[PDB]
Write a structure and sequence with these properties.
The structure is a homodimer of 380-residue chains. By secondary structure, the first copy, chain A, is of the alpha+beta class. The first copy, chain A, is built from twelve helices and 13 strands. In chain A, helix 8 packs across helix 10 (298-308) and helix 11 packs across helix 12. In chain A, strands 5-4-6-7-1-8-13-12-11 form a nine-stranded mixed β-sheet, with helices on both faces. At the A-B interface, helix 4, helix 5, strand 5, helix 6 and strand 8 of A face helix 4, helix 5, strand 5, helix 6 and strand 8 of B. The structure holds coenzyme A. Coenzyme A (COA) is lined by residues 46, 49-50, 53-54, 155, 197-198, 201, 205, 245, 258-260, 262-263, 296-300 of chain A. It is classed as transferase. The entry lists the keywords type III polyketide synthase, chalcone synthase, transferase. The assembly is dimeric. Crystal structure of the Huperzia serrata polyketide synthase 1 complexed with CoA-SH.
């Protein structure tokens, strides 16, 4: 059996976001108005404070005043609302991923018939057949596409899809994996409550977006353009982090429980989490590496930056994504990678990874699970 | 980078089921009593006829008369019931898998510390952290265990976990994958209705169970005992099968809709689906192969048997699993593999695959997706 020789390589990155732009400056005005919570004046000041410090400037949402008016239960706190949230999500998640996938396939330059695998991740509702099937059908991929559907994996899923794609691409000759992460906040949209302060954080951070990539080993020279090589993939459940990030798909929708200790737990353990991939590549200085860190919140980026002694330009690509699109869960880290290669091509840098050789793709979510990938950039 | 040489090998199989046995003969009496539908006499006769022709003799359930009385909403048709269904499923799914995993690890003979990967599949509710995290924690596996959580993939998931485990084991040296499939019917439990005849099928067929396997390449001689080798893994979405098995996770739980003839569609296309792996091994006669077909119902086993001209003993292991435990979704096909292996050992057959060299693991579900794996048995 002939197995491919080279590491799993990202051959194309494409992104998409819904067209309805919501400025973070005035998001509390919209948020408290659609959920009929204008009377909760003290809670609005608290949400304004969180939004002002969120590092987010704008977010793209599928949900509008019109869609929330047509589905009033989504605007209610504890009322049965899973059915209309799912009906929106099940349709929009693969549709958004379709636009991201088309852009990734167009950038790749090869026909869609060469796609042998499909890895899809979403935390925006569940359905049978899954979003993976829906995407495959919408794009017109081969009916024999090998699918890996990753439902409800949260914010580390951007890293999980690349970890899964690594093994699929590297173990199958000629395998070209379509990776897709798509998040639509229809299921997580929570009305503000004085009893759910961690729900205000999620409401200030979560945005919509989709990212798609083509991953494959042994790139065909003068045909495919290698962007990043995946050299190591792994994860870690952080000690004493039980219940730090919980998410339950209830009748009222997807309820997130975020403890305030999340940025601190990641900072305390980030050096230990990065220990194994660092030794694989002979301990390069943190400041000699590129960083595609999931913008879970600004406090996570600020505290990883401070704990590791990183120069302020390292977290810039992550902060730019957070500023322009917010926390798009699984999609976020792939948008960061796209921004890293785009900045590199725009500035005519030595490599696709901001001039640096090695880099990290870090995602975090439920567990607390921190998913890490060691990437090598390509010389340009 | 040193990659392993051999194919992904099943090194141990362990199974588990809840202790409450419900005989199929009198199941309609229990079912119509807990759901308060004793007055629906004509529907009871129709359900009795489905249970009598189901090929199922007994099913193991976590749900009892006691648990259903303490959770009245689960016994209702359209009343909001996802919350108590989830509370039960989220706790019981990894607990059942723990028991199956312990049995698999014990049969393997190596410490649990050597497990580098965990692939979990379930259609019995969703949660963040997933059932994968919960299983890893309950077993005390390394905090760095690489996880693949397969939620809501239905009845093909038993084959998907093996396809995923194939690439993980074959692309990583020393990798030992814990495969786990666990199904508890708390979410699929549907009160009988004259307006949901598709629900009667699921009510007559779905049972509880868990199966766990240890998958790895390059077995260390005189330490590990190879049971089956995975040589090919793939899938296919059957033509003109749109909406054949639709499953929606609603407020009232998991609702199934069967818009097409599932057993008829698989039979018509099975020759075409099996074409690629048969080609890999020079088209051996179907009757010279072992069959680990998912016991979705009696019709699928009967119709594949008739279309492919199989001798009656081929579907026996699948029929024995259906008879003893019903349709345990993802877990079923792995129980069949265990039964094929067990029959082979007790009858002192030449191979672990009932004397035959090559064989198929066929899973089917939403799409209509048919997942197939080509396995080679081990000489004993
Ligand atoms: C939420 C966040 C943007 C707030 O900005 P900040 O720079 O931390 O500013 P502060 O911490 O001083 O203020 C945050 C306010 O929200 C509260 N808050 C922050 N995180 C909270 C949480 N997880 N649960 C409840 N309240 C929280 C703080 O207590 C404070 O409330 P206050 O008005 O009574 O003082 C920041 O803490 C952050 O990014 N946190 C991580 C968010 C996260 O975990 N994201 C991943 C989600 S999967």
């Amino acid at each position: 059996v002939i197995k491919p020789d080279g590491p799993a390589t990202i051959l194309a990155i494409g992104t998409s976001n819904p067209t309805n732009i919501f400025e973070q400056s005035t998001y509390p005005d919209f948020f408290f108005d659609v959920t009929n919570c204008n009377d909760k004046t003290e809670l609005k000041k608290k949400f304004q404070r969180i939004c002002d410090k969120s590092g987010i400037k704008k977010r793209h949402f599928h949900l509008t005043d019109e869609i929330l008016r047509k589905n009033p239960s989504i605007c209610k706190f504890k009322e049965a609302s899973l059915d209309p949230r799912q009906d929106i999500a099940v349709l929009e998640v693969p549709k958004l991923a379709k636009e991201a996938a088309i852009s990734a396939i167009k950038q790749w330059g090869q026909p869609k018939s060469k796609i042998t695998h499909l890895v899809f991740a979403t935390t925006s509702g569940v359905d049978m057949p899954g979003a993976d099937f829906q995407l495959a059908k919408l794009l017109g991929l081969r009916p024999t596409v090998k699918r890996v559907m990753l439902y409800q994996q949260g914010c580390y899923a951007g890293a999980t899809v690349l970890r899964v794609a690594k093994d699929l691409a590297e173990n199958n000759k000629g395998a070209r994996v379509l990776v897709a992460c798509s998040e639509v906040t229809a299921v997580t949209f929570r009305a503000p409550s004085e009893t759910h302060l961690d729900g205000l954080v999620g409401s200030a951070l979560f945005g919509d977006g989709a990212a798609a990539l083509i991953v494959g080993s042994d790139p065909v020279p003068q045909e495919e353009k290698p962007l990043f090589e995946i050299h190591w993939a792994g994860e870690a459940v952080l000690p004493d982090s039980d219940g730090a990030i919980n998410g339950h798909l209830r009748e009222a929708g997807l309820i997130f429980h975020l403890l305030k200790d999340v940025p601190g737990l990641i900072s305390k353990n980030i050096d230990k989490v990065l220990a194994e991939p660092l030794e694989y590549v002979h301990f390069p200085s943190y400041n000699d590496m590129f960083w595609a860190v999931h913008p879970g919140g600004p406090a996570i980026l600020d505290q990883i930056e401070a704990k590791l002694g990183l120069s302020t330009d390292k977290m810039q690509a992550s902060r730019d994504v957070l500023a322009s699109y917010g926390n798009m869960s699984s999609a976020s880290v792939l948008f960061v990678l796209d921004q890293i290669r785009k900045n590199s091509e725009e500035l005519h840098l030595p490599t696709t990874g901001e001039g640096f050789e090695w880099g990290f793709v870090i995602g975090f979510g439920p567990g607390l699970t921190v998913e890490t990938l060691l990437l090598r950039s390509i010389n340009i």
